[PDB]
Design a protein around this ligand. Structure first.
Ligand SMILES: [Mg+2]
Ligand SMILES: [Mg+2]
Ligand SMILES: [Mg+2]
Lengths: 353, 353
């Protein structure tokens, strides 16, 4: 009934300690420069007439979606170039936006393969925009990493299709929940997009990169699920989250579902550190900066409402409460930025022009 | 080292006993009918000069691979049409060929996306043949199932790429083993290819089909990991396997890995029943025919050399050796068919003509 505040607090602090969440050389001024650069290129992109006409999305939602994504990319893909941040920001905004569509994909997918093989534009307008823009993203990567982004985005499309059914799985279908989360998680897209060929040699680091994808896929989706647990707790609109599907498919209490998620998240966090600590320094740096930035993004983006938790235990003398607050303040310290400092002008204004 | 023959018998018996292995998908006459029909069409396809030119494989290997796959398809896709069996046999023969192949995809995947988007033939000859043939397979399915086949085949390609490095994962990279197995397992391709639109309405059974894909993906791969353990054990190309990757990645004994696998496999089997038992009978039927036929195929087909094991423990007085031999005999009774009764003429002969 009530939110598991202490249990949530303990797990979150454990998660941050396990990943060695600490300060970086990534400054606020640098952040702002990156945020504005990525926002500005993406904003001009989505403001073009073709994009404005084929991408069915409410203007205010697009604006909010773009801002949250730019934040996610600039903060988590800390080592990539500005161009790479901008181009990845566009791709991930396309993916987030597809979740606003309730339109049945069936009719637009009947000739998917034949049109693809023939080089004809796809019937589904989202595929038309995404496949047209894709090269701007792939140009930053080698063939192996590119193949991964392509596959993950294709999986994501199928995941959105499945979700239109608002199905959490048949009771007893234990393998359904993760099958769905992987399908919609963009794990291999995220995992592989951390290695621009400009900074990494895909062939020389094949093993570390392949391993990063395998481990980051689960780390990223589970951390998102865990940190989204507070905002989703009482959301009666959101009915098929991973945790909620665990309840339905595994026939267990929400608490047990949360326990499952916590165990997987903490273990994933430890093996991440254990495996990459001794590997190539540049690789460990990218992985570590992703984890930290990804957490900071969740802590600083209003969408997750975690400030509400910080505000509820801000004066408790509990160990976890105090540790959570210190971490939170650390995050806001470098992540709490006013949108007026980078996200301007609005996409709709550039669209009218 | 030495093959855990003793434990191999223990696990195999447990699985067969739990699923209650019993193949009754065909009369001997029907089985021969389908095998020949599928083989004959596939044989004429692979004998075409274009196919002979681009598919780089030793004639004897192609021949042996085709017969192994015709058996897999006919034996497990018992409810689909002869045409579907044939077209699926061609597709899965392309994949098995790549499955044992040793090539570097890298150079021919550099312009993969751009060529795909422009409708230009792919540089990698395998993709050139597979994508050209694909429509003959997809015409049997609705858009959702088709999308699944496409994704799984693309995943499979990446899977074989990774295997080229003979990497079993970094010690402690717990997520690597299954990451790779799903990547190379063709799970969604197999699971989705069980629902031809001629017999099933993709929209009326969307949930059961999605569920079947999710659950069968793991049953399918795990069952093969267990049963194909023998032929892979000492094969250089198969040293990177789920079982052997569990050892390296999770730092555990081959024994523990096998027990882990069989436990998963038994659980997967249990939920398959629990979930589909009381669902649409036509769906349950296709699922049952696949599970039993899939096992029959592993016990009879050459590729898995399970006869060799039979010819060694047949005399042994162990209880497992007796259970295994009873099952092996039961499977041969229905599945042991002479190639001379259906696999003719040889591909090579049709090619020279
Ligand atoms: Mg394989
Ligand atoms: Mg193989
Ligand atoms: Mg195998």
């Amino acid at each position: 009934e009530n939110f598991p505040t202490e249990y949530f607090l303990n797990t979150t602090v454990r998660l941050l300690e396990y990943i060695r969440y600490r300060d970086s050389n990534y400054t606020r001024e640098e952040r702002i420069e990156n945020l504005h650069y990525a926002y500005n290129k993406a904003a001009h992109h989505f403001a073009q007439p073709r994009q404005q006409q084929l991408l069915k999305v409410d203007p205010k939602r697009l604006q909010a979606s773009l801002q949250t994504i730019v934040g996610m990319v600039v903060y988590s893909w800390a080592k990539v170039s500005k161009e790479c941040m901008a181009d990845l920001s566009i791709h991930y905004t396309y993916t987030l936006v597809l979740d606003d569509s309730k339109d049945d994909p069936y009719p637009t997918m009947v000739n998917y393969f034949d049109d693809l093989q023939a080089g004809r534009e796809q019937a589904h307008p989202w595929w038309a925009l995404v496949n047209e823009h894709f090269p701007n993203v792939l140009r930053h990567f080698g063939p192996f990493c590119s193949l991964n982004l392509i596959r993950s985005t294709l999986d994501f499309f199928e995941g959105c299709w499945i979700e239109q059914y608002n199905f959490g799985g048949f009771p007893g279908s234990h393998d359904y929940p993760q099958f769905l989360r992987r399908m919609n998680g963009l794990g291999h897209c995220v995992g592989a997009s951390l290695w621009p060929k400009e900074q990494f040699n895909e062939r020389s680091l094949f093993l570390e990169i392949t391993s990063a994808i395998a481990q980051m896929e689960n780390w990223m989706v589970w951390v998102d699920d865990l940190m989204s647990f507070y905002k989703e707790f009482d959301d009666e609109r959101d009915q098929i989250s991973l945790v909620k599907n665990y309840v339905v498919s595994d026939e267990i209490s929400l608490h047990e579902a949360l326990e499952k998620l916590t165990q997987d998240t903490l273990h994933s966090s430890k093996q991440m550190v254990a495996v990459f600590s001794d590997k190539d320094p540049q690789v460990m740096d990218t992985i570590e900066c992703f984890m930290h930035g990804y957490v900071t993004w969740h802590l600083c983006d209003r969408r997750y409402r975690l400030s509400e938790i910080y505000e509820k235990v801000k004066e408790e003398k509990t160990e976890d409460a105090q540790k959570f607050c210190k971490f939170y303040e650390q995050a806001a310290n470098v992540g709490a930025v006013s949108p007026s400092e980078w996200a301007y002008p609005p996409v709709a204004q550039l669209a009218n022009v």
